Amino acid sequence: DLKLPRQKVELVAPPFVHAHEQATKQGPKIVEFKLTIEEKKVVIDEKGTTFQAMTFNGSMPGPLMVVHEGDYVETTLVNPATNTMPHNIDFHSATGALGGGALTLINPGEQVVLRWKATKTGVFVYHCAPGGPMIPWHVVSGMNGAVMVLPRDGLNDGKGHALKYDKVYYVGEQDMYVPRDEKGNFKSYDSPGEAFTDTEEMMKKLIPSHVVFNGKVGALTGKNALTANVGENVLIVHSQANRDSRPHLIGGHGDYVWETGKFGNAPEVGLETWFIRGGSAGAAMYKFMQPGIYAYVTHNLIEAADLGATAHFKVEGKWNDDLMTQVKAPAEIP
Amino acid sequence: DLKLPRQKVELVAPPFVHAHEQATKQGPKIVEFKLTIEEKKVVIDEKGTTFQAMTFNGSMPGPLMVVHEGDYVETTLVNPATNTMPHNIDFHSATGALGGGALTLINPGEQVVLRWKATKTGVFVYHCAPGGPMIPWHVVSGMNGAVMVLPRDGLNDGKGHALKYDKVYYVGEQDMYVPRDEKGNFKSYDSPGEAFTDTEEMMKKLIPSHVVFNGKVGALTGKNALTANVGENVLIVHSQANRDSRPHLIGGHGDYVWETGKFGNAPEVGLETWFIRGGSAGAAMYKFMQPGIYAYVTHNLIEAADLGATAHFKVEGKWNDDLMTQVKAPAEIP
Amino acid sequence: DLKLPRQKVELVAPPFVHAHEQATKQGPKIVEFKLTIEEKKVVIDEKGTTFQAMTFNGSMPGPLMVVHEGDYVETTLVNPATNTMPHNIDFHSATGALGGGALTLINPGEQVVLRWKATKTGVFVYHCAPGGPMIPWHVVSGMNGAVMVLPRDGLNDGKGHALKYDKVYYVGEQDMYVPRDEKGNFKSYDSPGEAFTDTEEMMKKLIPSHVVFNGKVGALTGKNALTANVGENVLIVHSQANRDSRPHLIGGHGDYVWETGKFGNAPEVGLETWFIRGGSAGAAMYKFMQPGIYAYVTHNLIEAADLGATAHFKVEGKWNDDLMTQVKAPAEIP
Ligand SMILES: OC[C@H]1O[C@@](CO)(O[C@H]2O[C@H](CO)[C@@H](O)[C@H](O)[C@H]2O)[C@@H](O)[C@@H]1O
Ligand SMILES: OC[C@H]1O[C@@](CO)(O[C@H]2O[C@H](CO)[C@@H](O)[C@H](O)[C@H]2O)[C@@H](O)[C@@H]1O
Ligand SMILES: OC[C@H]1O[C@@](CO)(O[C@H]2O[C@H](CO)[C@@H](O)[C@H](O)[C@H]2O)[C@@H](O)[C@@H]1O
Ligand SMILES: O=N[O-]
Ligand SMILES: O=N[O-]
Ligand SMILES: O=N[O-]
Numbered sequence A, B, C: 001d002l003k004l005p006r007q008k009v010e011l012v013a014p015p016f017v018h019a020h021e022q023a024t025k026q027g028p029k030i031v032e033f034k035l036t037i038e039e040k041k042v043v044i045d046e047k048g049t050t051f052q053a054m055t056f057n058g059s060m061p062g063p064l065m066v067v068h069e070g071d072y073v074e075t076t077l078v079n080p081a082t083n084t085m086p087h088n089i090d091f092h093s094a095t096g097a098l099g100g101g102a103l104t105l106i107n108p109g110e111q112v113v114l115r116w117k118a119t120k121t122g123v124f125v126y127h128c129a130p131g132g133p134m135i136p137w138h139v140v141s142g143m144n145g146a147v148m149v150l151p152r153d154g155l156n157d158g159k160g161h162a163l164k165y166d167k168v169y170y171v172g173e174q175d176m177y178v179p180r181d182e183k184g185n186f187k188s189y190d191s192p193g194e195a196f197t198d199t200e201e202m203m204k205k206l207i208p209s210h211v212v213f214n215g216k217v218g219a220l221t222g223k224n225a226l227t228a229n230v231g232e233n234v235l236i237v238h239s240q241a242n243r244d245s246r247p248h249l250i251g252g253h254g255d256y257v258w259e260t261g262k263f264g265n266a267p268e269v270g271l272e273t274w275f276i277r278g279g280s281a282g283a284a285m286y287k288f289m290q291p292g293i294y295a296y297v298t299h300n301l302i303e304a305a306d307l308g309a310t311a312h313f314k315v316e317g318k319w320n321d322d323l324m325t326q327v328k329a330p331a332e333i334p
């Protein structure tokens, strides 16, 4: 029925985001994406703890999909025979059939093609949701990502002005539940199925062992720190499919923040810390003013420093002594 | 002193809501309600776990009371001699005397009549609050409900347009704390008083055993699923008197959401997931676009799927293939 | 370089706030503050539990600093040789160098002078953040306070009207993690260093033993209840540097609330309960209408009643029977 132009997107791994337009002169298109599910054992911390992950496209989070209002998003979801479990996909951006979940349940060896019309603007979670107790399990095993639906005129501040970002990053936060043995060491398992009983028991107690960005402690640091230059406006999309978070850029602010993540609402301005409700994505933009290292955290600092939820930015440019200066370096008290 | 017309309301059990006007040509009235407290042992899950509940009018949540701005709400609170504990009522909608709590403490065998002027619009929690450690205990035992204070002109979108709902449901969410024995089985108790010591010990650790809607796992499913038709605008009032929640309609959205619950503020639009602060009620309206089953959850999916916090909607009407379609059913990967 | 007038502030202990102007005709100044760090063992509850606290200026929270937009805040941070640990300060109001933390690390025996320009309006957390796992530890040991950056025209309602408070209080909420011995009694320690291992183990489990205002159970009660008169507009600044909170004034409302705490955004109106994201300060103003006792709580009522997070207001004036009246005192049921 649907006679619109087709455009393929090459997805890229988080925290990066596939190339896209903000404001566009294009009309509605059918935008084609492929997600291939991968179950895999991964390392989640610097001590070598392992984890039975379940992923879209091999990453935690799944990649960010970007379209415009009124596009049709046509996803080929692939569950190779090398996986063990059925899977599906639920888009919080979509209308009907449990977000798509009721139309996309696929066994290992199968694929399905779902299309949904992008009638709601904002950033939104997508996640697997097979049914029943498998829903939380697949999500907290890593099977969640996000999609961004931009207005065709790009972003605005609510107050008629365009808000154009120079770059965008996607920070997906994952609560993980790794059981411990009697000795107190984290357990390792041979399969997701073997991990399930212990993992569910822990899940129901509601306290994660790890809270990470991009799948692992320290993922968005060192070589893989986020970057910017003084003067650049950076959009940071943050999602959490199961559990609340409170993002904060240490040494910066949220200049324009959509904490509930939906562009039909004006952004709030000048925030210190914002709030991502579990089951949602939000977004914050900041124009960097100072060079140096920043930490981007959830501001439960226990989670940030001790459970894994810290990213860095390394920012280039000239220090601004008007905004901040060390008037007197550390010295002995007179 | 107060010479206004009197109107009696027949309360109805949640999730339903007693008949009322949205916009009205009536002026202020004294609106009369009766709440009769019932302490009772109830079943809270499909395994037969029992629970020492304390209720207004026999239900968890207590029933939704609906009035208009500037009405006077005159409540006869009754504590029959068949109960064991003192009780009272605190309305977050009311001004003075700890919300009414300091004027309504009644022993078994007593009743009291409190009137308060509805000067604040929105949805609001009411709950028992006897004093001290009994406050949390009575609340988490089930002694909470909500009241809705509508503008006399009905609801609006902030942007001069009326927002008229076709039906309203009240979802009261309850965190419950049922201790376990050494074997790991939930305990049963002969009285609320006998449950108290174990229950308080658990409460202070801040992790519920169950998180339910309408008093029990699965209460708002099967026969008792919520219903709608494609084209109907449904208001969903959600309250949580003690603990945060993050509502989400799976396959839908919050078209207009007052997550802090107060109609003096414009609604937010197009939300995926919203946030009910513990100690509050909020409200979301959605116009259904697709038939079929929806789940309405808190989007901590562990809580939703594993601890009890899932409702269903069954929606009648015609499927819209423009909004969503299964382009290719599950098939073997080529 | 900076040739502006200098003004010294004499800080005062919370919940009080040093004298300041709301609207002002002054231009930018360099506003001088001194904070002297004190590590000390304190009592945190009415049972005599002790706690290894780390403080700015001897108090939990640290004192509220008040300036205006475009002022420069020049803080002398002093770490006397009588302390054991290094410390620093991070202002969420400031731009660059991890909020100042990267420019203020001082060993016992040292002091440092940091200046930052107040370019963001609102209430903001400040806290110590030495590095790594020490960050959460110093914060949850008490090393956090707040700063308020007022517009030069004072506060407004977003809708061109001034919002002038008659008094302001600062409620700093502290999550505390005091381990228990095998017997189940809270442990005491001879030094912060000796407390660290047990305290970190508990911290990572994310459940506080105590949640207090102004450093101790019952701190803002009795002699030290907050006060008001009917007719007075009271601003209540609330901060939580590590963990969410949901403030509520029992028997009142938030007439004007900036829950995210930033004055570039209009306040919300008529709230029952608001939400302070961990890592932030927010503010609520209320004009008292009724005399008597109010409780100001976090509306996790377990936390409020059982873990320490209750303050009182004692309010003088004339009871308003229009707003609320006891129509019939407790009596036997007919
Ligand atoms: O930022 C969204 C917010 O801005 C307002 C204007 O106050 O509308 C702007 O954004 C809309 C969505 O992009 C545009 O359609 C509109 O033309 C533009 O003024 C609000 O209505 C909206 O909530
Ligand atoms: O939806 C509430 C929001 O709308 C505004 C207009 O932007 O006011 C509307 O609602 C008021 C409350 O019902 C009415 O009194 C008013 O006349 C109407 O325009 C905002 O002021 C308010 O925050
Ligand atoms: O309350 C802040 C809110 O109000 C608006 C008007 O709707 O702006 C007012 O506040 C600004 C900050 O103090 C002033 O600069 C402005 O002149 C005044 O109208 C909004 O723009 C703002 O979000
Ligand atoms: O801003 N520091 O946690
Ligand atoms: O929207 N699904 O959890
Ligand atoms: O408002 N009482 O918890």
Ligand SMILES: [Cu+2]
Pocket: A054, A086, A087, A088, A128, A129, A130, A138, A143
């Ligand atoms: Cu899956």
Ligand SMILES: [Cu+2]
Pocket: A090, A092, A127, A279, B248, B250, B299
């Ligand atoms: Cu979901």
Ligand SMILES: [Cu+2]
Pocket: B054, B086, B087, B088, B128, B129, B130, B138, B143
């Ligand atoms: Cu009671």
Ligand SMILES: [Cu+2]
Pocket: B090, B092, B127, B279, C248, C250, C299
């Ligand atoms: Cu209450």
Ligand SMILES: [Cu+2]
Pocket: C054, C086, C087, C088, C128, C129, C130, C138, C143
């Ligand atoms: Cu310190």
Ligand SMILES: [Cu+2]
Pocket: A248, A250, A299, C090, C092, C127, C279
């Ligand atoms: Cu911080």
